[PDB]
Amino acid sequence: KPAVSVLTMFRYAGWLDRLYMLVGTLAAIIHGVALPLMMLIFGDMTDSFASVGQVSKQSTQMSEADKRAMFAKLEEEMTTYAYYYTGIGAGVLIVAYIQVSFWCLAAGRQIHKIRQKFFHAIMNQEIGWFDVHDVGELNTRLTDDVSKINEGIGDKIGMFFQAMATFFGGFIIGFTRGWKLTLVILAISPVLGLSAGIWAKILSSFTDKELHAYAKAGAVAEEVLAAIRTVIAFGGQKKELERYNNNLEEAKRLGIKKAITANISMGAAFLLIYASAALAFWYGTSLVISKEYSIGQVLTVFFSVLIGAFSVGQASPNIEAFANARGAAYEVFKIIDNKPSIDSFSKSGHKPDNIQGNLEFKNIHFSYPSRKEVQILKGLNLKVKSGQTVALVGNSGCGKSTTVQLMQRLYDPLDGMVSIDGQDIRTINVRYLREIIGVVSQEPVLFATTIAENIRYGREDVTMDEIEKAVKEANAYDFIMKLPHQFDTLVGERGAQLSGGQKQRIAIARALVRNPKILLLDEATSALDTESEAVVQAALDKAREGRTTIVIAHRLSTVRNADVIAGFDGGVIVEQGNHDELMREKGIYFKLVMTQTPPASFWRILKLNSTEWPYFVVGIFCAIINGGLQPAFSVIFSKVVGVFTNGGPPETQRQNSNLFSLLFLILGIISFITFFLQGFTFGKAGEILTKRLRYMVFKSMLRQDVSWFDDPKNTTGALTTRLANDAAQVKGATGSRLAVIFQNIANLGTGIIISLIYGWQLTLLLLAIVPIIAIAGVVEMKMLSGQALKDKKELEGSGKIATEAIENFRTVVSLTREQKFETMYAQSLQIPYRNAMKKAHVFGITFSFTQAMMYFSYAAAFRFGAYLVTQQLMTFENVLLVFSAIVFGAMAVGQVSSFAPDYAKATVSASHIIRIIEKTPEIDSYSTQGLKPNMLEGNVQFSGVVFNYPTRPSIPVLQGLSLEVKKGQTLALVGSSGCGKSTVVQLLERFYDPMAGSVFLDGKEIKQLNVQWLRAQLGIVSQEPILFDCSIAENIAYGDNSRVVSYEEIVRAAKEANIHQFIDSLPDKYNTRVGDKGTQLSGGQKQRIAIARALVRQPHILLLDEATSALDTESEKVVQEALDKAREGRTCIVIAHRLSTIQNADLIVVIQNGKVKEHGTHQQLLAQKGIYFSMVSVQAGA
Ligand SMILES: Brc1ccc(Oc2c(Br)cc(Br)cc2Br)c(Br)c1
Ligand SMILES: Brc1ccc(Oc2c(Br)cc(Br)cc2Br)c(Br)c1
């Protein structure tokens, strides 16, 4: 929404840049004007053939006499037009170079200036400007927004003025040569703009319906794949597939309905567009029979008008490129034009010599850019004598850290002044002030250069002698010399990461080369290992003694030797004095001392599509007919102009033109009929395999075992996305792109035959010219992408050192050396600059070549179409036919290169989708094999079970676990922590087979038992019961599948679960909808329902996995009261964390490291004193 003045945007263009644009926009207008004139000449060549075409047939008497006057007229005329034609091509060759080269030159020259001024402005902002802004967005604003500015002031402006030249020049020739066709052509424009307007209303409204349609099926997939362990436990995998299959059935009916309507729309709009044109041309014919406009003049206007009419559309993108570059330049120039109060690039203020370093802080009130929300310093008074070292202590707020901030004048205070020596700090030059102040901060930062270079960031003029004395004066010399490469080592986020105490020592040496008169040490010892802390502390003590120093830290070891200590309470300076005096004061300071002491040939996807042997042959045969039918319109056009140029006696002409225009409209309606078929057939054929694919995938997905659904690769969202994308992508490959790719190869094929079977030596020439200009059009795009990738790689190195400069900004400004990063960024940009200079010459040459290759190709089309061909016995009507036929059949092949990624993006989506079906699990619920015992009573035997989870085979959970529980008794399961308690329930459900050992139920190993039948005897109840969106009766009846459960039966379970108070209180009762879609209720009712569906199954084994986990107050007392009634009649395994409710259990087992540690009845493990006795004691006391 915000934008820039047009003149301010070009503020960096002067002298030559203004001229380049002037000559550039000039030649660009010359380039545009060249095309409608080329069409004006195409009319004069027609009249030459038309005057001879009328007189040649007018004879029917003399023959050799027509070998004289006609050929002579053709000789002087065709040579004149071909001479003019060759001139236009040389014109476009020059102006198209001038057009693109000059504009890309001005673009490259200015963007170089923009990028330097921009980065200079970034480093010029004061710190308070950075505290309110995001540096990451700022750096991306540097590389991206400048690119948008470059796209808008580049060769696009030349293309814009080239287009308006065609537009103006087209309608000028349109009006002057005959303004009775222009107004007729404009009259059909609203119809074409209205038909394409129905497309923007149909596409936008129906694209939501499909994203709405599958969102109902993908919702089924979501609540299923999220509750996968519940449907797996209750075996609803046929139902959840059936539901998904039932929603897929509706999505395909809405998909074929959209295929019917969208193809009716496309064919009707195409027929309206072609009938609109054929009327404007048949109207053109009605004005030639009236002897008002020559047969060649109708072409001259009809072409120049339609050329300039579409030149509007070809200019609209360049308008958006310029406007976007304007608005992109707003926030950029806003930074450049913004002037700071602090500067630091300013050359102003005093530079005191013989600085003795007497600092004082006077009544300083301050607040960080958070402003009126917080005021961290309410008044202040602090002096520090020269040579002394004052220490600042404080409980919190870190108002200590603020004084170091103000001392470098990173901010100016709200009220009060900071005084170095006697002068106010704001009277001293900012840079010189930062140069007389050395800074060592808590987190040290080293730029990605050598050690000597990082030390060289203290002062640019320095020799390795000073570097050596500095690092030796910080006792950092000894440890770096052992490091290889000596001072020439590397540092940074990338490469040679060092100890913290060593990086700080380099930072102390960096600040030591500064030879500052003022020293500021902010928590430099804090957040550092204890051993190396003394090593750095020795250097800090050796860094002072020649300077006045303010130091802030939470280490009260470094503070004793300070001449003065200062305490803060709420930004107010409270206590000050020597260490001993503050202890006698027994104030804040004393208080803090005591406190701290694979693309491949996949035909089988087409073999699955072979379910429909028809519907394809219908579409293909219908598409090839539509292919063979398109050039016949060019054939009709060739003979509407052909018989009119070849007319001779004019009486027969007027009756023939009516017959052709009629047949055209009969071919158009027969084109509409065949287009709707090839669309509908492919559409329906695409929508049905969408169901088959999503059905087989969702079926095979419900086949895999819990081992697969635990994969971090496969989450519920990543599966629904893999489910939607892979099915829609393969539809596009076998869909429109194929019907089109066959319609077009038939379009060229039926066009190339007619052209080859007509004009001799004529088609053979055009077949030498057209492929070369097509290839030359391709190679230009390749060099364009290569230059684009190359320039992306080069400015990346610049923005990389810009990223380092601005992300570590607060450090660089503290060391000044901003001019250093300026010079580095400038040297980095110099290569893309000289690169951008060559880009203009290349871009202009390629564009001018492809334009000249199109214009010269046109001269050879007529000079050969006349002369050798028309001096013989070859007619013009065919040359026109071969033109439209070949040129259109080629431009129809241009759609093959556009649908190419639709094929690759589908094969990759097919690659996954063929494997996701074929993958088979270790435990397949679909296998009908298995025992299915007849004996009801259930035992459970865990024997020697070692189990590790397939996702984390690192820490084992079960190591030699052994339980046994008889029928009708409760097996309590206590554990120190982890799924060691829970893994029992998962293995009994046989979510996994154990690594070693085995688990039995009736004495039969479940591993050889039937998987589905095994889980059919289990009454699983988990922590968070997930209930699908349907009737609570269905959530209850979900407990028994393969049979519809009686209402009184699901009532019995709801009576059993004590949930019946709700189920009758509701208005809908058992038919109420739950799942946070129709109604919402608390977890206690959710659990009771899960208990009901558990015992609707009438299991012989309950499995209660921390059922009271998420529950509170009386809700626990009523759900436990329901669970306690559900067991005692069945085999039961309870792992609940309420050991008070486990007291009445037939056997309590303590799990330890996967082994059973203690076991026995409650009082038995209470008689013993150990883990279970400690478990019952800790949470009974707490
Ligand atoms: Br835009 C444009 C349209 C037609 C051009 O040549 C013609 C011309 Br002029 C007339 C017919 Br019919 C077919 C072709 Br191809 C040229 Br060169 C450029
Ligand atoms: Br009659 C008649 C035939 C073709 C005409 O131009 C074309 C041409 Br040339 C090719 C195709 Br495809 C469609 C149309 Br409409 C015109 Br205008 C009038």
Author numbering: 30 to 626, 689 to 1273
From the paper:
The multidrug transporter P-glycoprotein (Pgp)/ABCB1/MDR1 plays an important role in multidrug resistance (MDR) and detoxification owing to its ability to efflux an unusually large and chemically diverse set of substrates. P-glycoprotein (Pgp), a member of the ATP-binding cassette (ABC) superfamily, is one of the most promiscuous drug transporters in nature and is capable of binding and expelling a very large number of substrates from the cell. The binding mode of the environmental pollutant BDE-100 in the DBP of Pgp was also previously captured by XRC and it was shown to be a potent inhibitor of verapamil-stimulated ATPase activity of the transporter.
Two mutants, Y303A and Y306A, showed strong BDE-100 occupancy at the original site (site 1), but also revealed a novel site 2 located on the opposing pseudo-symmetric half of the drug-binding pocket (DBP). The differences between the Y303A and Y306A mutants present a puzzling element of their roles in polyspecificity. The pattern of anomalous density for eight crystals of the Y303A mutant and five crystals of the Y306A mutant clearly shows a slightly different binding pose of BDE-100 in their respective sites 2 (not shown), yet Tyr303 and Tyr306 are involved in site 1 formation and are as far from site 2 as any site 1 residue. Furthermore, we detected no significant differences in the binding pose of BDE-100 in site 1 between the Y303A, Y306A, C952A or F979A mutants. A slight perturbation of the canonical site allowed a second copy of BDE-100 to bind to the DBP in some cases, and therefore stoichiometry does not appear to be a stringent requirement for polyspecificity.
